[PDB]
Every structure is written in structure tokens, then in C-alpha cells.
A = this chain, B = another copy of it.
């Protein structure tokens, strides 16, 4: 950055703001549907939907209903979904074995979508917290500590089962050290050459996940694996490791409360960069809009921010709404 000695009144930054045509020409960033990933909550049943108290307007969907809705998502141009199964309580355990069940919700939903919409991206969730009895993120030792390498063993089995289901992207959200490299090695050994790994690289120990926990039925803290909200430099180490270990894309989470992190990650690594606008961000915005406190326009404003900050792709519960505005 060079200021180039620009000075009022020779330089008046309002001249370009004067007319819509000059604002449109110089406009630095834009949201398009190419940027959008829709996370979806998937039920076990058939002919079912459920409303979520802390996520107004978001539904859990059984797989038949998910296929119906996906027709419109595909028509809108949304490139990918991110699947989050809502695991029945009977299928939760200490060993999280349901993670790699070829008939688990994630695996069944994946096969169904891959067959019905071959061009639609399916990003599965590599994670043990949907399958543990404690909603905790992995296998626990006697002190209640989430064991790093032993949990990865389970995540690796899960990632393989997602690849076999035909998922084009697996996205480890677990924050175990080294899991990206372990999952990549396994995929490569098993001949899953082209399965992308979307690392949750810099995923903070946040209070903004509350409504997601209600959505998935897992509703303890995670400061021993998820990042301290205070730390920024530390995020660069996380991403560097994950790129070395073979991630095809890297993600910051949560989103708008961490835009500075998005900016640094894109600037320093110049790699495909993703950001999750999490359940709490969605719920904050949607709550204020429904209360009449904010205009609908905040939705696009929030999504434009992610582009401006350097994100290539955004995981957002507003993906459908945003895509419909962009179609119009």
C-alpha cells in the first residue's frame, strides 16, 4: 500500500460514490451463488420435518424431504450442501461406532443425493460429536480428556465410509492435531484419489454454536482442542499444518466474529479459503429481522463481508434466501 500523496480536494473519494454506474464499476467484491454452501440437518425417518427453537425458519429433514428440497437448491445454482445428521439417541455410544456405519444417516443421505443430483457437491461432516453419548468430540480418557490419536483412528474410518458413500468432500470439524494428514494418507491408500478434504483449520472455542447444538440434538466446553477466541497468530500455524498435511481447502469458524482471521489466512496462504457463518450468527440476524429491528438487507451485507475478507466459499444457513435474491 502506497497512499501516492492523494489529498483533498484533488482527491474526493465521493466522486466515485456519486452515481450508481461508477459505484458498480469500482465495486471491489460481490457475492454470487458460486460462493454458497448450504448446511442441512438430516433426520432418520421418512416424510418428516421438524422445526428448531433457536433456528427460526430452519428445518430438520428426513432424506425423502431432503431430495425434494434439493431440486430447488440445484435450480438456484447452489454448488454444495454440508450434511449434518441428527443421530437417534439409541445410536450414540462411547466408541462413536455409528460414525462409520455404512447405513448411518450421513452415508444414506450421501448415496441418495449422489444418485439423484450427480453434479451437486456433498460435503460430509468428519466428527465424533454426533455419535458420542456426551456430545463430546472424541474418545475420552479416564480424566474426561479427548484423546487425540485414538479419536483420529475413528475419524479415519468415518472419512473412508463417506468416500465409499460417494461424498466428493469430507470436512473434519473435530480439531484433533494431525487429523488432516491421517485422513489424507488413508484416502490415498484406499484409492480415494480425488476426495477433497475441507479442513476446519482455525475452529474457535465459541459460544456462537449454541443453536447448532439444539439442531443436532447434542445439547461441557472444548478449550482443550478448539482455539481460544483471543488468538490470531496461532490460526496461521493451524492452517500451515493442514495445508502441509494435504487439505484441498481450509476453513475459519465461526465467521463474522473472525473476519480478521479470514483476511490473514487468505493473505498469507493464497489457498482455497472457506468460512462458516454459524448457527448463532444466523439466529442473531434472523431474530433481529423477524423482530423488525433490522432490514432483510443485512443478510447480503453479512455475506458480502465474507467475500471482502477473502473467503472463496461460505457455509451459510441463508444460502437459499441469498440464492433467491441473486436469481431475482
Contact = CB atoms under 8 A, between A and B. Distances in A.
A280 B259 contact: no
A34 B25 contact: yes
Given A207-B298, A268-B1, A294-B207, A29 B231 contact: yes
The 9 A-B residue pairs with the shortest CB-CB distance, nearest first, are A10-B246, A8-B178, A21-B121, A259-B259, A4-B243, A260-B309, A233-B270, A54-B293, A260-B263
Given A230-B30, A284-B285, A207 B297 contact: yes
A293 B211 contact: yes
How big is the A interface, by class?
A: 35 or more
Interface in A202-235: 206-208, 210-211, 223-225, 227-234
A2 interface: yes
Contact of A280 (B13, B238, B269, B293): B293
Interface string A72-101: 000000011000000000000000000000
A327 interface: no
Interface in A33-73: 34-35, 37, 53-54
Contact of A13 (B3, B177, B195): B177
A271 to B, nearest CB: 7
29 contacts: A3-B5, A4-B244, A4-B269, A8-B181, A9-B177, A11-B241, A12-B178, A13-B237, A14-B176, A14-B177, A17-B223, A18-B196, A19-B168, A20-B119, A21-B120, A22-B79, A27-B230, A28-B233, A29-B230, A29-B232, A148-B193, A207-B294, A208-B294, A208-B301, A229-B305, A232-B308, A237-B270, A259-B263, A283-B294
Nearest to A188: B9
A140 interface: no
A164 interface: no
A232 B272 contact: no
A159 interface: no
Given A2-B269, A25-B272, A257-B302, A228 B17 contact: yes
A298 B256 CA distance: 13
A129 interface: no
Given A3-B2, A3-B240, A228 B23 contact: yes
A245 to B, nearest CB: 6
Given A18-B224, A26-B312, A280 B294 contact: yes
Given A231-B28, A238-B13, A301 B257 contact: yes
